[PDB]
Design a protein around this ligand. Structure first.
Ligand code: MN
Ligand code: MN
Lengths: 137, 137
């Protein structure tokens, strides 16, 4: 039986700017680094950055909707978004769903998100206003 | 600050086979589905499958090392891996370069992993058998 997400590994084209982005800009804790990768944590999340020459710096129009959302409190959301904006981090989507969301790109074009709100909160909103074809279990 | 992973969203090309893979084959909990997506949980992971016409079924030699690992206990690991193998689930990696792991593909070629152990345990293992150039903070 699977008990949760063990780790998220992102392939990166250049290790130093990716470490700078996740550790310094996004405030994650750097636990270890080696010639071809790094381990960071963000709350319970174990993040691995893996240097991979096959990673392309990918424009958002050229990747699908797969994306990775990090939790932040409502009270902290606006100043964190402003920090990303000051740093020139690109946005790939505007928020049109429930709960604050900021959609931003990492240095290689990985699609990231800041989101406020849990699955329970989303399900409650969906029960009141179900998406087309929505069934609950 | 950021406090962990709020959700993982995977773009999928065909919603029903992807729901079946995560719910039936991997045993995740299905909470809701709709014409364009589904919400599942795996422990405290919120997984969203999002139907995306841009998603392509991608062979593992065509994608980079970005991957998603799910936690499993030492007692359950081998039989779960063997069940996936017997079910014909495609693979993408064989060499255990980061501990006890089984590397397998979802229907669209998303790179998945079963892994036994925490970040703390992986750091302790790496102190004895470190990756080249490894530094610990
Ligand atoms: Mn999202
Ligand atoms: Mn892994």
């Amino acid at each position: 039986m699977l008990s949760g997400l063990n780790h998220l590994t992102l392939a990166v084209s250049q290790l130093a700017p990716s470490v700078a982005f996740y550790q310094q800009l996004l405030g994650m804790t750097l636990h270890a680094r080696w010639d071809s990768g790094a381990y960071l944590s963000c709350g319970d999340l174990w993040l691995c950055l893996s240097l991979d020459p096959q990673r392309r710096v990918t424009p958002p129009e050229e990747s699908d909707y797969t994306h990775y959302a990090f939790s932040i409190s409502e009270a902290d959301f606006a100043s964190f978004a402003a920090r990303l904006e000051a740093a020139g981090v690109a946005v790939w989507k505007l928020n049109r769903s429930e709960g604050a969301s900021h959609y931003f790109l990492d240095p290689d074009g990985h699609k990231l998100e800041l989101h406020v709100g849990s699955l329970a909160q989303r399900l409650a909103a969906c029960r009141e206003q179900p998406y087309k074809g929505m069934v609950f279990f």
